[PDB]
Write a protein that binds this ligand. Structure first.
Ligand SMILES: *[C@@H]1O[C@H](CO)[C@@H](O)[C@H](O)[C@H]1NC(C)=O
Ligand SMILES: *[C@@H]1O[C@H](CO)[C@@H](O)[C@H](O)[C@H]1NC(C)=O
Ligand SMILES: *[C@@H]1O[C@H](CO)[C@@H](O)[C@H](O)[C@H]1NC(C)=O
Ligand SMILES: *[C@@H]1O[C@H](CO)[C@@H](O)[C@H](O)[C@H]1NC(C)=O
Ligand SMILES: *[C@@H]1O[C@H](CO)[C@@H](O)[C@H](O)[C@H]1NC(C)=O
Ligand SMILES: *[C@@H]1O[C@H](CO)[C@@H](O)[C@H](O)[C@H]1NC(C)=O
Ligand SMILES: *[C@@H]1O[C@H](CO)[C@@H](O)[C@H](O)[C@H]1NC(C)=O
Ligand SMILES: *[C@@H]1O[C@H](CO)[C@@H](O)[C@H](O)[C@H]1NC(C)=O
Ligand SMILES: *[C@@H]1O[C@H](CO)[C@@H](O)[C@H](O)[C@H]1NC(C)=O
Ligand SMILES: *[C@@H]1O[C@H](CO)[C@@H](O)[C@H](O)[C@H]1NC(C)=O
Ligand SMILES: *[C@@H]1O[C@H](CO)[C@@H](O)[C@H](O)[C@H]1NC(C)=O
Ligand SMILES: *[C@@H]1O[C@H](CO)[C@@H](O)[C@H](O)[C@H]1NC(C)=O
Ligand SMILES: *[C@@H]1O[C@H](CO)[C@@H](O)[C@H](O)[C@H]1NC(C)=O
Ligand SMILES: *[C@@H]1O[C@H](CO)[C@@H](O)[C@H](O)[C@H]1NC(C)=O
Lengths: 910, 124, 39, 80, 48, 48
């Protein structure tokens, strides 16, 4: 009988207290949803790498277990029993100490038998097992038995992401290797994944076996004739012997040091030019072997001399490890040559992993190896059969995971990048596909793209807007029920009815208010270099004082960035000399500005839209950063001051139009300013006046929608939130980098100084200091690049303030989509929001048109319009609003005769 | 990269402020841009922006349109102003009052839709 | 025809400079918009 | 204290300011301190809330317009 | 110019190609490879 | 490049040296290659 382990068997990986964190642990765990064997009340189950043991009982049938390798008298075995009074452990070692679900975890590592446990009043909940005891039994355990429903699962080395509660309780976990969604969660260090595509890891085919290929020679080297020589030469006339075509077994070989190699490794390497130099003295890659020859031997050595002057026989072994064909090396057994399969290979000490194939390279007899452009081995001559084999790394590639978001579904698709589906790793065992999970093909759910093979999404022939970009024109989305892949649609097809003489004239218009969000500044950061690198360690500070002006450069760069942020804000918002105020009576010809004008009721004196913007952008983690020496400097201009600048700009534009940006503010009624702006887009003034109320209503409607368009869309303020998130992420990464060891024995300086002598403590501390200094320099460089980008954004925002708010712009698409009428600024936490009011023509109508009109034999061209017709009579109209008028001498000018203008049309000019 | 952005901006200003007259607000100095003159500087350029700044503003009473013979008149290339008794039409950026005639205005509709229309004589 | 691309980031089936770079772990990703879509 | 020297005490969002007297008047920012606070040398060092400029009210109404009667030719300098 | 080549780097493959001991050692260097991947992914998205 | 190590091949270092000195050599190599990657990414960011 088998059953599902669900999410059970999580234990506390260490004795350290943690709280409100996500912590990654690589340890022996019970994989989620494992098939655990179920017994009912017994056999001797194996003890593979550790055992999870659950018991659901109320009568104490289960008491204990026996552990061992053979469970006989010839081999030592362990024994654990829980008596009603105490628990007795015996092995050379004895130990005694003190429905319901009892869960246990047993491990055997490094001669230690470790036991964790938990008790609970298989269930489908989460419970973390606390440790019980480590015992130094010192015996290898391969089997075990329960001593009389109980469940047995087997642990394997897995990576888990554990979530600690506010009071430090492990409340949730993610098994990183369970499936692609869990791998994505572990990559992001989060339990929730938003919609998107995520590079999670790389799949790598694993080596099937290992092969060794050494030369066929078996003769032993004449080491005895060198070391066991009756008489050694003199140090000046030192003796040299060559060693070639033999098997140097160095185990036959007092002082024995080696330069460039280790004495415990010489049996594994293959050497090219071995020379042994022997002589006698008194007390480059190779080895030096010196030994006292007092009882064997001008020095004039005598038995009554001291050790410092006794004779010493010295042998120097010199060899070249610069590959080339190998003539001498130690005892290694060659295996068969495995081809066309990812294997671990060892060719005369050249170790690697990959696929070996027949090579067409035209080697030359002296050539034992081939190299690629990167100076890495690419071809090898087999030492025994002398054939040329190409080495190519076995199949690998990148893996991306497409998720609709965990808030919507747990289904995922998987993209194997740069791989066709015929070569997608298809393995029935865990000896391939490094992510170690499997997504199987079910026919219609495997698709080929120029970006790779997509498994888990069905390709539909329909086209939609891109939701999750896959690449090469392919996108994916949650259909709802399943994930679908498709070719993205560029938009709805449209054919403009072009002809010789047809023109479309708008008969109506729409007042459109659109939003543009621009970052203006980012968080000003200061770093206490010593506090970050050393943090209360005075010895670290003294050592750090020897690395030059690194911290001075970083401080200068960060101070420059901080000053630039205030400069950006000033350049964007401090354009007006005066602080203009709105008049007490807020009547502007029917235009309602209450949503953008400041509200006296609010203490901040912000507009409703500005209040919404400041609510929609989120500006103990701060304390954690502060304790490491990373601080945030306040901006020079407060939010109240920026809002005051914005109110001054709005009052100036509302009460004076564009005049206050070019000189003294000149009051003008708002309908008259609107008529000016209508003139600015080639529409006559009366069109505004005769439609005044309607226009006002449209604006009042459009501005009314703005709030919703910012409070309903999730990522409306995505750019400012991105600025904030980038700053927070950079600081959090800087903080988390303090737990890195960078190759040292610990990440705590006071632990290194309190356990090591200064000569080696200096090495470890130098490793830590260089790592942390590199982290700081990387952070500062990224800050400089981001500051340049933010400065470009701020220059653009200042240009928009000048050209869209202080004037009317004729630049297409610079101040909104349609024809720009005017714009309003609103301050936002780290930037500015422009509300662009534009004129969009609407309700177009077809008309017949002509270039000119022939009348009395003269050609007439329209002065400020275009000729149109119902079909019988001919009018002249303005081009952006249908207002037909009688064609007179006053709205027309004469040029030439009606003999050269192609398309000229006969009519009368009143 | 920062200096390249500055040099691109300087080239844009040379093209648009020195080789032409720019309508872009505050791109070629404060005020209504007239012209610009370049001067070389050790590692850069100095633009001398000549702009027109209005001064000595005066208050006037204004109307959107003038009603005459039941017809609404809108100023062709100006704005209606008044001493207080008579009504003139003037260019927007410099006080140059002119007699309201049928040659500096245009007619559109009756005196029933425009809010703020004022009765006056439009000389012919 | 006048600009000679290096990779363009399309499928490379197991079997020159691009191959060496890929074996060193450096790959090119295809653009989202194809040349036909941009045209 | 690490600086080993000691030094008209004021609290700001930027920190503790010692040696400057906070005045109620507002001037243009001379030396920026932070969060709207600037410093200046008056015989003494003063800290103050920076001013944004002179308050101004445009005489807006639905039938009044201000029209310039004169002009000034301005020549300004931009250094790049 | 509008876009440039989108590059991806397998950090482990570049630094410690086929050497498992080197990757085990590289695991002690923190989030360098993660930061590099984030930067390159940002660039790649920016190209599109 | 070797970056002051005995070789630019990780496998050779692991096969020729005991862990105490292999640590120094592999640290040099890994630091050099991480620096190369970081330089490449920084220049890619500026170019982007
Ligand atoms: C953690 O334990 C404390 C101790 O009483 C409790 O108040 C708090 O609610 C717990 N946190 C949870 C349950 O998230
Ligand atoms: C020298 O001779 C002794 C005994 O004959 C032997 O044990 C030893 O291995 C020899 N040394 C060498 C280097 O062959
Ligand atoms: C992948 O290999 C198959 C089998 O040869 C081939 O048909 C297919 O075209 C390859 N993929 C691509 C994208 O060419
Ligand atoms: C007008 O367009 C039609 C096609 O729509 C074309 O056949 C005709 O030649 C064009 N007119 C002239 C004068 O060519
Ligand atoms: C123009 O559109 C508005 C709606 O915005 C509508 O109320 C009005 O009747 C339209 N005018 C004409 C002439 O169609
Ligand atoms: C302006 O709009 C707001 C919100 O729609 C409304 O409450 C207010 O009454 C309006 N003001 C006028 C004068 O109609
Ligand atoms: C103008 O004519 C084209 C075809 O001649 C037609 O498709 C279009 O709908 C017409 N537009 C209007 C407003 O009737
Ligand atoms: C000509 O245009 C006028 C608009 O003034 C319209 O009343 C009349 O019906 C049009 N004639 C035809 C034949 O469409
Ligand atoms: C327009 O009228 C003139 C008058 O002489 C005539 O010659 C010409 O053919 C007419 N055009 C058309 C297209 O009928
Ligand atoms: C215009 O009138 C207002 C209010 O009567 C006054 O404050 C302002 O100074 C006047 N403007 C000029 C230029 O006299
Ligand atoms: C009205 O304008 C006329 C100029 O023709 C003249 O009487 C005077 O300048 C104005 N009247 C007043 C009272 O200013
Ligand atoms: C303007 O004249 C019309 C008709 O001549 C009259 O109804 C209206 O009251 C007059 N306006 C004023 C302000 O007296
Ligand atoms: C025009 O302005 C005056 C004074 O500013 C005000 O009393 C009047 O109500 C305004 N016009 C309208 C239609 O509200
Ligand atoms: C205009 O200003 C100038 C000074 O720049 C002065 O000399 C001149 O008299 C003024 N003209 C008028 C009409 O005020």
């Amino acid at each position: 009988a088998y059953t599902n382990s669900f999410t059970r068997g999580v234990y506390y990986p260490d004795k350290v207290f943690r709280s409100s964190v996500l912590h990654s642990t690589q340890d022996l765990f019970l994989p989620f949803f494992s098939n655990v064997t179920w017994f009912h009340v017994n056999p001797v189950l194996p003890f593979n790498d550790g055992v999870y043991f659950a018991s659901i009982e109320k009568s104490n049938i289960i008491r204990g277990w026996i552990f061992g390798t053979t469970l006989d008298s010839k081999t030592q075995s362990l024994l654990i029993v829980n008596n009603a009074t105490n628990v007795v452990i015996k092995v050379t070692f004895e130990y005694v100490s003190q429905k319901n679900l009892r869960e246990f975890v047993f491990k055997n590592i490094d001669g230690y038998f470790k036991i964790y446990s938990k008790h609970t009043p298989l269930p489908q909940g989460f419970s973390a097992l606390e440790p019980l005891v480590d015992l130094p039994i010192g015996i290898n355990i391969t089997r075990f038995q329960t001593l009389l429903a109980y469940y047995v699962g087997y642990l394997q080395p897995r990576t888990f992401l554990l979530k600690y509660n506010e009071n430090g309780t492990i409340t949730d976990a993610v098994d990183c290797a369970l499936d692609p969604l869990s791998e994505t969660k572990c990559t992001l260090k989060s339990f929730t994944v938003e919609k998107g595509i995520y590079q999670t890891s790389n799949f790598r085919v694993q080596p099937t076996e290992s092969i060794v290929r050494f030369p066929n020679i078996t003769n032993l080297c004449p080491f005895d004739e060198v070391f066991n020589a009756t008489r050694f030469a003199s140090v000046y006339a030192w003796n040299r012997k060559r060693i070639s075509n033999c098997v140097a077994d160095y185990s036959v070989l007092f002082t024995f040091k080696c330069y460039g190699v280790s004495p415990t490794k010489l049996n594994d390497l293959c050497f090219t030019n071995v020379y042994a130099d022997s002589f006698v003295i008194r007390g480059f890659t190779g080895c030096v072997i010196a030994w006292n020859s007092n009882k064997l031997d001008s020095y004039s050595f005598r038995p009554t001399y001291g050790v410092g002057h006794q004779p010493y026989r010295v042998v120097v072994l010199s060899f070249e490890l610069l590959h080339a064909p190998a003539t001498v090396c130690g005892p290694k057994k060659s295996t068969n040559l495995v081809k066309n399969k990812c294997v671990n290979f060892n060719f005369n000490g050249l170790k690697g992993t990959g696929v070996l194939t027949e090579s067409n390279k035209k080697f030359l007899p002296f050539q034992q190896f081939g190299r690629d452009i990167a100076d890495t081995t690419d071809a090898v001559r087999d030492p025994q059969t002398l054939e040329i084999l190409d080495i190519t790394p076995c199949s690998f590639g990148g893996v991306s995971v497409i998720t609709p978001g965990t808030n919507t579904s747990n289904q995922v698709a998987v993209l194997y990048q740069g791989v066709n589906c015929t070569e997608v790793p298809v393995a029935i065992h865990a000896d391939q596909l490094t992510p170690t999970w499997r997504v199987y093909s079910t026919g219609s759910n495997v698709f080929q793209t120029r970006a790779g093979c997509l498994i888990g999404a069905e390709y539909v022939n329909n086209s939609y807007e891109c939701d999750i970009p896959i690449g090469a024109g392919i996108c994916a989305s949650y259909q709802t029920q399943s994930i679908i892949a498709y070719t993205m649609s560029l938009g709805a097809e449209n054919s403009v009815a072009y002809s010789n003489n047809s023109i479309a004239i708008p008969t109506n218009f729409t007042i459109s208010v659109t939003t543009e969000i621009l970052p203006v500044s980012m968080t000003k950061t200061s770093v206490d270099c010593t506090m970050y690198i050393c943090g209360d360690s005075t010895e670290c500070s003294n050592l750090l004082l020897q690395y030059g002006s690194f911290c001075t450069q970083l401080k200068r760069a960060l101070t420059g960035i901080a000053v630039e942020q205030d400069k950006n804000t000033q350049e964007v918002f401090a354009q007006v000399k005066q602080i203009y105020k709105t008049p007490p009576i807020k009547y502007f010809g029917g235009f309602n500005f209450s949503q953008i004008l400041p509200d006296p009721s609010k203490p901040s004196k912000r507009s409703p839209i500005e209040d919404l913007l400041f609510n929609k952008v989120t500006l103990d983690l701060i304390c954690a950063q502060k304790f490491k020496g990373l601080t945030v400097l306040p901006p020079l201009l407060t939010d109240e001051m920026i809002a005051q600048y914005t109110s001054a700009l709005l009052a100036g534009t509302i009460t004076s139009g564009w005049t206050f940006g070019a000189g003294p503010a000149l009051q003008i009624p708002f309908p008259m300013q609107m008529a000016y702006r209508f003139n600015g887009i080639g529409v006559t003034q009366n069109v505004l006046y005769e439609n005044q109320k309607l226009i006002a209503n449209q604006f009042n409607s459009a501005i009314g929608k703005i709030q919703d368009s910012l409070s309903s869309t999730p990522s409306a303020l995505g750019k400012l939130q991105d600025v904030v998130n980038h700053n927070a992420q950079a600081l959090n990464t800087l903080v988390k980098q303090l737990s890195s060891k960078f190759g040292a024995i610990s990440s705590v300086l006071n632990d290194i100084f309190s356990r090591l002598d200064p000569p080696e403590a200096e090495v470890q501390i130098d490793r830590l200091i260089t790592g942390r200094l590199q982290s700081l320099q990387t952070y500062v460089t990224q800050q400089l690049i981001r500051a340049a980008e933010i400065r470009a954004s701020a220059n653009l925002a200042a240009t928009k303030m000048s050209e869209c708010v202080l004037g009317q712009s004729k630049r297409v698409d610079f101040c909104g989509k349609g024809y720009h009428l005017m714009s309003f600024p609103q301050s936002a936490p780290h930037g500015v929001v422009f509300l662009h009011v534009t004129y969009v023509p609407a309700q177009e109508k077809n008309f017949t048109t002509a270039p000119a009109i022939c009348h009395d034999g003269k050609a007439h061209f329209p002065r400020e319009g275009v000729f149109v017709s119902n079909g019988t009579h001919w009018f002249v109209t303005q081009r952006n609003f249908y207002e037909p008028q009688i064609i007179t001498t006053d709205n027309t000018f004469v040029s030439g005769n009606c003999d050269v203008v192609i398309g000229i049309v006969n009519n009368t000019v009143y | 990269a920062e200096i390249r952005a500055s040099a691109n901006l300087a080239a844009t200003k040379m093209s648009e402020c020195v080789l032409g007259q720019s309508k872009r607000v505050d791109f070629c100095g404060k005020g209504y841009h007239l012209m610009s003159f370049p001067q070389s500087a050790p590692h850069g350029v100095v633009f001398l922006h000549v702009t027109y700044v209005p001064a000595q503003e005066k208050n006037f009473t204004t109307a959107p349109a003038i009603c005459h013979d039941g017809k609404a008149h809108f100023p062709r290339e100006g704005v209606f102003v008044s001493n207080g008794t008579h009504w003139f039409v003037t260019q927007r950026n410099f006080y140059e009052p002119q007699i309201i005639t049928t040659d500096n205005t245009f007619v559109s509709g009756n005196c029933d839709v425009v809010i703020g229309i004022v009765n006056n004589t439009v000389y012919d | 025809n006048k600009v000679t691309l290096a990779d363009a980031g399309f499928i490379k089936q197991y079997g020159d400079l691009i191959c060496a770079q890929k074996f060193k772990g450096l790959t090119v990703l295809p653009p989202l918009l194809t040349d036909e879509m941009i045209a």
